Structure formats: structure tokens, C-alpha cells
Write a protein that binds this ligand. Structure first.
Ligand code: HEM
Ligand SMILES: [Ca+2]
Ligand SMILES: [Ca+2]
Ligand SMILES: [Mg+2]
Length: 523
């Protein structure tokens, strides 16, 4: 059958570049650069770090109220790494975040001169001088498992064995090592994993789900070859790839979005192929509204055995999970994490980000604040303010801080940071909204996510329901439709006791009762 390109071209048969690598991020409406060119938006607002301090600071654990597991954010990130990537422009354009004088984490010597580093995002070089700067998406916009296969044929080929349609692995059926020194977040070291997306080593949970899908690909490839001998490597590879790409769509629209968006989730079925849809990820989605992962993040990733015990090498502190393959290689493999993610409730969706990523220090000595980066990134990308974005999406504009949040502490923080509802950073406003009834997000986030996911459903010629391969093999289409993330976890690991919907935490008594007779209580 027809197969997707690796680069996302030739999906839309008129604008063939649409959805492909290196396309512009779309915009919902006009950019808000101060000068209409490249000068950052939000130049009247406080420091991104002052905003982080004033509204994202979290002193205690705050569980979500909809029973959602850590799988919601882990899938969210994995799927993000299928949708969009924008690295730094080169030559580097520095746009540092001023640290408030006396900031207890980043300026404890009261210098008044500390910054958090940020280089401005890559953009189309034909933009940003005489017209608005348009940032580039460096992976395929399509939900096509480019996070497994790569977004260029060179990397895609590097990931393959070229025998039996398979993807390379390392010892213990783990991701292959980057021995060829291809581009990779964390650098070109051969001791880092190589996956379809360059960010796979970012943290161990991400790496674990990347590994899972390499396992699933190889299972499919082996079984296809077994059932259909005489088929060549290329044919087996493309068939397994097409099944895995369909799985990404099915899990995303049937499990993840219903979990996160709830009442606001878009239909999991396409209304039909609309080739007029721009599938290029929207800047305001990629670089604000879909960055709702950071507020969900838990301080620890649980690592559990089949009895629900913490494994001997302990749970994994989020900070210990960054750019370190050994957490998987030497501390129990992927199975404990896959189970663990299903077994803990994520943090609430709100302005608050855990200290583990808001105040990640490397040694005073500098470090990482994901809240500050997100805020500055939205100013780098010329994103419209929160309220303008509401109007861009056909929502009413707010006219008071009470219109944003019914929490008086959130109201007060927004007031004392911004002074007017019309100059709030999109990411901050979006996360400040009261949640829709039956949802874990507010109206703006619902609308922006709803829009993006509607486009990628109806705008993709290889949306799985209309791929000739699945149309011509209805039994496979049906088996795909009945496939959940838990099924993939189970058949590619040694996990025996996991709930069928890994996006929802299990009944409170589950771990205790499974532990009975085998409980390890010293962890
Ligand atoms: C441990 C978990 C996570 C880590 C460590 C992490 C880290 C990062 C970092 C460092 C960036 C770049 C920040 C910047 O300089 O602008 C980023 C970007 C992003 N993150 Fe997160 N993130 C996590 C979870 C999530 C989740 C759960 C989601 C979505 C549900 C998400 C969505 C995004 C998106 C959309 C971007 C922009 C991606 C691009 O287009 O380049 N992240 N993440
Ligand atoms: Ca993709
Ligand atoms: Ca939170
Ligand atoms: Mg070949």
C-alpha cells in the first residue's frame, strides 16, 4: 500500500510540504513581536523568573482531582515529541532571563545580576527582518510515530537493522546506543540511547516509552515475517511502522485525550479527509498551551514490581532521571517505570510547578527553571497575550482577573505581576483558568488542544481509519481499534498486574492487596 514519507511530505497532495520537517509553525493569528519583526513579545512584563516566583512556586504536593496517573504527562511528552521540535537558532541569539535580586535559588548572594540562559529558537531565515519571525518545526507535524522512526531518511535508516523489518536494539531489548554519533539531546556520546526523536534521553520515563514502542515494532515485524514469509525487509518495516503509527493515533484519541480533556475531548473518529487544513503545529500550541506537561510532573517516578512493591534500587527522583541511560540499564529496565507511571496520581493542572523542575540547581551556581523557560520561550516566539489568544480562538475576552480564576490567591498573583488582564503571558493565563466541568483543563487550553487535535485527525491523509492498508485489512483495523496502551505494555514486558486504562490510577486498595504475602515495607 502507499506508505507515509519519513519526512511528512507528500501527505497533502497539493501543499506537499505541509506537515513536513522544517515547515513554519502555524499561527492562530498575528504574532506579537514588539516591532512586528523579531523583537520579543512581552517586553512590558516582569522577568519570566519573577513570574515563576510569583505564581508557579509550589510548596507542597497537590494531586490532580480527576484520578489521572503519571501516564497522562508521560504520554503527553512522548506525543509532543511526535508533534513538534524547535531547537536553538545558530548562530546563537542570547535572550537571557533576569534573576530577581536575592532570589534564594538563583541569586543567593544578592548580586542583582544573575540570569537564566536562553538561546532563541530556530526560524525561517526569510522571516523576521522585514516581517514577523516564524519559528520552524523540525519534525513531522503528523501523528506518525516520527518519535520512533525519525523525521529524516538518514536517521530512519540508522535506526533500522535492514533485516526482517526490524529496528536496532541494545542488550536487554533496550534502545540502541548512538554509536554513529547522530544528533541527540545530551550530546553525541555513544553511551546515550538513539531513538526516532532526538530528545529520548531527556528523562528515563520518556526513554522507557521510546523503548516500549521499539519493542512493539520488533514484535510486529517478527510476527509479520513469521506469518508472511518471503516478504522483504522494507515491506515488513513499513507494515510494522504503519501499525505503530496507527497505535499512536488510537492511544492519543481514545485514551490520552479523553483522560486529560474529559468532557472537552475531540471525537476519536474523523469526520472525513479535509485537505484544506493546515497541519503545521500551531506556535501557540507547541510553545504554550500544550506545555501543560510541566504542571502535571511528579517529583518521583515510581518503580514497582508485579506485587506493587518498590524495586530494590528505589523509586526514581525526577532530577536523577535526566540524561542518564544507567537508570534503565542498571536499575531494573523499563518495566518498573511502565508500571510505576500507572500507579501514581499526577500533580494538578494549575500554575504550580514542582521545585524539582522549577528550581533545578546544578551546584548560586546556576541551573534550570522550566517555568521561566516556557514563559521566556513564548516571548521569543512572539506569542499573543492570553486574552488576545482567547479572542483568536472565538472565546469571550476576559475583563477582570476574576474572569480568569476563582482562586483569590491566583487572582492576586496575576494582579501583582501583570496589572492588566490584557498583558498576561499566554502560558500563565492558560494554566490559571478554572477547569471546565468534567475536565482537567480550562476553556482556553481545551479550545487550543481541541483545535490542534481536530486538525491532525481530519487533515492527515494517513489517518488510520482511511489508510488503504487498514481499509483492505479490516480485521487488523479492528484489532488496532481494540488496542490499549496496557496491551502494548503487557506484551512487551514482564508486567502482569496493571489496570486496563493506565491513564487512571488503580483502586486505592489494589497495591496493598496485591502486596499481601509479599510486601516489602522498608523501601
Ligand atoms: C520530565 C518531564 C519533562 C521535561 C523534563 C520537559 C522538558 C522540556 C524542556 C527543557 C523543554 C524546552 C524548554 C525551552 O527551552 O523552551 C520542553 C519543551 C516542551 N515540552 Fe516539556 N518537559 C517535560 C514534560 C512535558 C510534557 C508532559 C508535555 C506535554 C504534555 C511537554 C510538552 C512540551 C512542549 C510542547 C515543548 C515544546 C517542544 C518543541 O516544540 O520544541 N513536556 N520540555
Ligand atoms: Ca510526527
Ligand atoms: Ca501543577
Ligand atoms: Mg533496505
Amino acid at each position: 500500500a502507499q506508505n507515509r514519507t519519513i519526512d511528512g511530505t507528500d501527505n497533502n497532495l497539493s501543499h506537499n510540504v505541509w506537515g513536513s520537517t522544517n515547515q513554519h509553525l502555524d499561527r492562530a493569528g498575528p504574532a506579537a513581536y514588539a516591532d512586528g519583526m523579531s523583537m520579543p513579545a512581552g517586553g512590558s512584563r516582569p522577568s519570566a523568573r519573577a513570574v515563576s516566583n510569583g505564581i508557579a512556586a509550589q510548596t507542597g504536593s497537590m494531586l490532580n482531582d480527576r484520578m489521572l496517573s503519571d501516564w497522562v504527562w508521560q504520554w503527553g511528552q512522548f506525543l509532543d515529541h511526535d508533534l513538534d521540535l524547535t531547537d536553538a537558532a545558530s548562530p546563537a541569539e542570547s535572550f537571557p532571563i533576569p534573576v530577581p535580586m536575592g532570589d534564594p535559588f538563583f541569586d543567593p548572594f544578592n548580586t542583582g545580576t544573575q540570569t537564566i540562559g536562553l538561546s532563541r529558537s530556530a526560524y525561517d531565515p526569510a522571516t523576521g527582518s522585514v516581517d514577523a519571525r516564524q519559528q520552524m518545526n523540525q519534525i513531522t507535524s503528523w501523528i506518525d510515530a516520527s518519535n520512533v522512526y525519525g523525521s529524516d531518511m538518514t536517521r530512519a535508516n540508522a535506526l533500522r537493522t535492514m533485516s526482517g523489518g526490524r529496528l536496532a536494539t541494545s542488550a536487554g531489548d533496550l534502545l540502541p546506543f548512538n554509536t554513529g554519533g547522530l544528533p541527540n539531546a545530551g550530546g553525541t556520546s555513544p553511551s546515550l540511547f538513539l531513538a526516532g526523536d532526538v530528545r529520548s534521553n531527556e528523562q528515563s520515563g520518556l526513554a522507557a516509552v521510546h523503548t516500549l514502542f521499539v519493542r512493539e515494532h520488533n514484535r510486529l515485524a517478527d510476527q509479520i515475517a513469521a506469518a508472511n514469509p518471503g516478504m522483504g525487509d522494507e515491506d515488513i518495516y513499513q507494515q510494522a511502522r504503519k501499525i505503530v503509527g496507527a497505535q499512536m493515533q488510537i492511544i492519543t484519541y481514545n485514551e490520552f485525550l479523553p483522560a486529560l480533556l474529559g468532557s472537552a475531548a475531540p471525537s476519536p473518529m474523523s469526520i472525513g479527509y479535509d485537505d484544506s487544513i493546515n497541519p503545521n503545529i500551531m506556535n501557540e500550541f507547541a510553545n504554550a498551551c500544550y506545555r501543560v506537561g510541566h504542571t502535571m510532573l511528579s517529583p518521583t517516578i515510581l518503580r514497582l514490581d508485579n506485587a506493587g512493591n518498590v524495586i530494590p534500587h528505589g523509586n526514581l527522583a525526577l532530577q536523577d532521571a535526566f540524561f542518564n541511560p544507567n537508570r534503565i540499564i542498571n536499575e531494573g529496565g523499563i518495566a518498573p517505570i511502565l508500571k510505576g507511571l500507572a500507579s501514581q496520581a499526577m500533580q494538578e493542572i494549575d500554575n504550580k510547578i514542582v521545585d524539582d523542575v522549577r528550581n533545578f540547581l546544578f551546584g548560586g551556581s546556576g541551573g534550570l527553571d522550566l517555568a521561566s523557560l516556557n514563559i521566556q520561550r513564548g516571548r521569543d516566539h512572539g506569542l499573543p497575550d492570553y486574552n488576545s489568544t482567547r479572542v483568536m480562538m472565538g472565546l469571550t475576552s476576559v475583563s477582570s482577573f476574576a474572569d480568569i480564576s476563582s482562586d483569590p490567591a491566583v487572582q492576586a498573583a496575576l494582579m501583582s505581576l501583570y496589572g492588566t488582564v490584557n498583558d498576561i503571558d499566554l502560558w500563565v493565563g492558560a494554566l490559571a483558568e478554572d477547569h471546565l466541568a468534567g475536565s482537567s483543563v480550562g476553556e482556553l487550553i481545551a479550545a487550543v488542544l481541541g483545535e490542534q487535535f481536530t486538525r491532525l485527525r481530519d487533515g492527515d491523509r494517513y489517518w488510520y481509519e482511511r489508510d488503504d492498508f487498514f481499509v483492505n485489512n479490516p480485521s487488523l483495523l479492528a484489532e488496532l481499534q481494540a488496542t490499549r496502551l496496557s496491551d502494548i505494555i503487557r506484551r512487551n514486558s514482564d508486567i502482569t498486574n496493571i489496570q486496563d486504562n493506565v491513564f487512571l490510577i488503580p483502586e486505592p486498595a489494589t497495591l496493598g492487596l496485591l502486596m499481601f504475602g509479599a510486601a516489602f515495607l522498608r523501601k
